């Protein structure tokens, strides 16, 4: 209930809003519907308009007026922006050329630069160059700041997930603003874009950064603008804030904007009539740099021009209807449009089984523009399957399409040509990233990065402790010209064994059959001092991974490769291998093909057997040091060790195999050398971390043998690439995967075909961080560099997308 019976009067624009039923004066009473009776009257002014004009030089103040253009102005902080222009000869700030802010030059009492974050809904990243000749104030911006070429997204690219990881640094999954639209099965509660619902705190988690702010003493204004309030009233009330005395005055401001993205749904990203919306926001800026430049702020504040997402070319035409696909189409709920969730329609149905329904869904037609997937099957580097709020069946949608139940739901609601929620790595996703402030650097382009790693900058930028997030602390580091944040390597929980030769052949009992009866002095003791590191500083560059957690495991040495050999999984932890640009391809040789040798380093307790593997009907196995790249035939053997042997299922060992074979010699070739690291993953829980033992959900039959979810590699290699791998001086390039390990390829719907048709292809969209495989590990990699170590954390937040430019 509301008594809108009270009066505004004084209150206008409230930094502490009041409780039910007494009336609000603040910028988000209107979206509520409890603004006292006066507040259009008082606090929505607009006589007279948005500017002042040469005969309004020096009139009488005239409290109806929008804005004013009176001598005392300036001291009340309520001038037109361009009152200074017009009434005392001064230039607008896009005019001025710039001047490198080395320090903050703030008026007295101001203890911290203020930051003003400006965010533009649905600005993709390329209207920064194919806009630049219709916004002169956002380019010099660009230009004199600090400024990345694009920023991603996180998915789903929808609105609410994206201001919301903006606020928190948190992914959808963790902050649990999953969609646009959610249905929450603990609350039995559904939250939409249109009413009420979404007002209830339980729906958003983390502490986003107008909290932080506040529980460390450092007072925000208020961040969200009902849709109603003109823009230029949204500029007028933050300046008038910037003029309040010290201690009311707050240090951090949101100006949020609907365009570009209204005007990009109804006409596409480069529709004709999108150069209007794009003049007007360049004003809107325009008009926030002439009203900070009149209070003496135009030095002072560091401000952020910031997307949440871009847009692409969407029509109603291109729309897949699960009609086509299902004979069961009214037994199921679908989130519909760029991305697809399916739940049961009701839960007392026990036909409705997913699995079938999936079956129904994949490689159906030729061109299918949607692929269905279990949520834990989705892209690693997604991070989007830990949450209640985030069903079992997901479709991703192909750019430029959408997905529907039936044909009714398009046409009773073409409407749109432009949408987004598409795949976070797609090129028209994309979004723009701008500082410009004392606190940020001058003139300098930054490579690009994602919107989960800001929350930690502008906690930087206000001297504040972020909560715990999803950011790298650091990896932003050269973006700023100081408060820059100084972490320390996490410490080595575990620390490793290093055994010698302890057993003897007849101790083992692996029901293999190897062929390795062949036979010296000279390559005796050469064999020998392999075992003990002589080519370590040519297979391992970086340093030994870090274990940050408890357990025991074992160093490994050998002519070609090193492991960290984990005695409680059976298997590497970590392989790492350098493979030069000169290296041989030779093949597998048939005395060896079902050949697997015990290793006398390691107890027949702590090792895997071939028997487990022979009785397993779906479980094969694999090697995670390649035996098609070793060195020479004695080091060869070390390939067959029953300590390199890992299990595989027979339709992932084609993938495996073909990177192995092919794409690794290939990367070598193009990169001038690569060190290869590769090892399992366990995340049964899909939660993105590291699992425990207790937390395995499969083993190979009849053993303690645990099965990997997924495969992971990461390539390294030198920047310059005139320079070898193995004699960088100085920074790295690097790629990375996190393969499922899946017993089928049903994902790829040309597996019939070669390996050369599908596989790279499947890897391209399984590309990951080396941050996302540090979380599933539970290890820390390039300990040992000579780089700084922000650099070694931008280093392991990169991409590599393979999009175009
Ligand atoms: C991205 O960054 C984030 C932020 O750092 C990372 O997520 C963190 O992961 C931590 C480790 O898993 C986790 O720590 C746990 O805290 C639990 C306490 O929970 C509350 O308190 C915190 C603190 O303020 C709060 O953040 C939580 O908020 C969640 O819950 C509600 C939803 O119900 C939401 O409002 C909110 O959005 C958020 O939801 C998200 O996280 C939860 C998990 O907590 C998910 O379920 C949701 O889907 C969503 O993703 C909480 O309100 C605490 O219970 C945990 O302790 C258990 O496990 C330990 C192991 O140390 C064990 O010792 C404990 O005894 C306990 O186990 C007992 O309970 C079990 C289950 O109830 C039971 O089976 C056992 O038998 C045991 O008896 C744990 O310490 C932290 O909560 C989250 N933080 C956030 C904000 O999500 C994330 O990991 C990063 N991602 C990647 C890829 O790196
Ligand atoms: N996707 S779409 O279907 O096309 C689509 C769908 C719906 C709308 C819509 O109605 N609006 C009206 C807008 C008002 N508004 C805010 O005031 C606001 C600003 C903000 O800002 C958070 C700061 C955090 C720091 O970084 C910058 C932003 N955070 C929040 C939320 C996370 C807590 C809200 C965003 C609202 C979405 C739309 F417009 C487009
Ligand atoms: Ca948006
Ligand atoms: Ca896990
Ligand atoms: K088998
Ligand atoms: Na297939």
Redesign the pocket.
């Known amino acids: 209930w509301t008594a809108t019976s009270g009066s505004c009067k004084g209150r206008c624009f409230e930094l502490q809003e009041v409780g039910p039923p007494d009336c609000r004066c603040d910028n988000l009473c209107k979206s509520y519907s409890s603004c006292c009776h006066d507040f259009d009257e008082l606090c929505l002014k607009t006589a007279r308009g948005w500017e002042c004009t040469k005969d309004r030089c020096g009139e009488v103040r005239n409290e109806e007026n929008a804005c004013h253009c009176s001598e005392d102005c300036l001291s009340r902080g309520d001038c037109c922006t361009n009152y200074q222009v017009v009434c005392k000869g001064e230039s607008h700030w896009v005019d001025d050329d710039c001047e490198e802010i080395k320090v903050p030059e703030c008026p007295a009492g101001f203890v911290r630069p203020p930051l003003i974050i400006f965010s533009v809904d649905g600005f993709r990243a390329s209207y920064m160059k194919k806009g630049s000749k219709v916004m002169p104030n956002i380019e010099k911006l660009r230009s004199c700041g600090t400024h990345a070429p694009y920023m991603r997204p996180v998915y789903p690219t929808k609105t609410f997930p994206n201001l919301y990881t903006l606020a928190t640094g948190?992914?959808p999954?963790?902050?649990?603003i999953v969609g646009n639209s959610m249905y929450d099965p603990v609350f039995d509660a559904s939250f939409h874009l249109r009413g009420r619902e979404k007002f209830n705190h339980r729906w958003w988690?983390?502490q986003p950064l107008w909290i932080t702010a506040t529980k460390q003493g450092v007072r925000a204004g208020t961040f969200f603008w009902s849709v109603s309030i003109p823009h230029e009233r949204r500029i007028l009330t933050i300046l008038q804030w910037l003029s309040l005395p010290d201690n009311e005055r707050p240090s951090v401001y949101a100006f949020y904007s609907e365009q570009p993205d209204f005007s990009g749904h109804k006409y596409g990203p480069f529709g004709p009539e999108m150069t209007n919306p794009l003049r007007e926001i360049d004003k809107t800026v325009g008009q926030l740099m002439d009203g900070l430049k009149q209070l003496r702020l135009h030095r002072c504040v560091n401000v952020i021009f910031v997307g949440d997402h871009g847009m692409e070319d969407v029509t109603c035409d291109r729309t897949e209807f699960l009609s086509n696909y299902l004979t069961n189409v009214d037994d199921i709920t679908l989130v519909p449009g760029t991305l697809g969730r399916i739940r049961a329609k009701s839960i007392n149905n026990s036909k409705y089984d997913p699995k079938t329904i999936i079956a129904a869904l994949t490689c159906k037609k030729p061109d299918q523009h949607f692929k269905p997937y279990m949520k834990q099957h989705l892209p690693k580097r997604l991070?989007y399957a830990?949450?209640?709020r985030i069903e079992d069946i997901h479709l991703l949608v192909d750019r430029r399409w959408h997905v529907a139940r039936k044909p009714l739901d398009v046409y009773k609601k073409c409407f749109f040509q432009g949408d987004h929620g598409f795949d976070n790595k797609v090129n028209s996703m994309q979004t723009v990233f701008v500082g410009y402030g004392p606190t940020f650097k001058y003139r300098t382009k930054v490579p690009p990065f994602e919107n989960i790693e800001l929350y930690n900058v502008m906690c930087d930028l206000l001297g504040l402790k972020p909560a715990?997030?999803?950011g790298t602390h650091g990896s932003l580091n050269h973006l700023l010209r100081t408060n820059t944040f100084r972490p320390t390597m996490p410490d080595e929980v575990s620390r490793p064994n290093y055994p010698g030769i302890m057993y003897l052949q007849s101790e083992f009992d692996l029901g293999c059959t190897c062929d390795d009866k062949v036979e010296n002095k000279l390559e005796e003791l050469n064999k020998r001092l392999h075992t003990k590191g002589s080519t370590k500083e040519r297979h391992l560059l970086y340093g030994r991974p870090a274990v940050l957690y408890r357990t025991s495991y074992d160093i490994l040495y050998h002519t070609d490769f090193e492991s960290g050999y984990s005695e409680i999984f059976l298997m590497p932890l970590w392989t790492s291998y350098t493979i030069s640009k000169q290296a041989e391809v030779s093949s597998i040789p048939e005395h060896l093909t079902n050949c697997v040798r015990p290793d006398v380093r390691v107890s027949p307790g702590f090792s895997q057997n071939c028997l487990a593997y022979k009785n397993d009907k779906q479980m094969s196995y694999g090697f995670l040091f390649p035996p098609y790249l070793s060195s020479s035939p004695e080091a060869k053997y070390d390939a067959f060790l029953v300590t390199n042997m890992v299990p595989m299922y027979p339709a992932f060992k084609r993938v495996w195999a073909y990177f192995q074979r092919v794409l690794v010699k290939k990367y070598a070739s193009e990169r001038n050398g690569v060190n290869v690291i590769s090892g399992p993953i366990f995340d049964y829980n899909y939660?993105?971390?590291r699992d425990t033992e207790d937390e395995i959900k499969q083993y190979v039959e009849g053993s303690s043998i645990p099965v990997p979810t997924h495969y992971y590699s990461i390539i390294t290699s030198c920047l310059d690439f005139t320079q070898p791998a193995d004699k960088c001086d100085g920074p790295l390039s690097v790629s990375s995967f996190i393969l499922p390990h899946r017993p089928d390829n049903d994902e790829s719907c040309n597996s019939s075909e070669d390996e050369s048709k599908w596989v790279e292809e499947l890897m391209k969209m399984h590309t990951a961080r080396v941050r996302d495989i540090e979380?599933l590990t539970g290890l820390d990699f390039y300990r040992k560099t000579s780089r700084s170590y922000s650099e070694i954390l931008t280093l392991k937040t990169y991409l590599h997308t393979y999009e175009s430019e």
Not at 173 to 176: A, I, R, T, Y
């Open positions: 948190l992914y999954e963790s902050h649990g988690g983390g991070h830990n949450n209640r715990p997030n999803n939660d993105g971390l979380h």
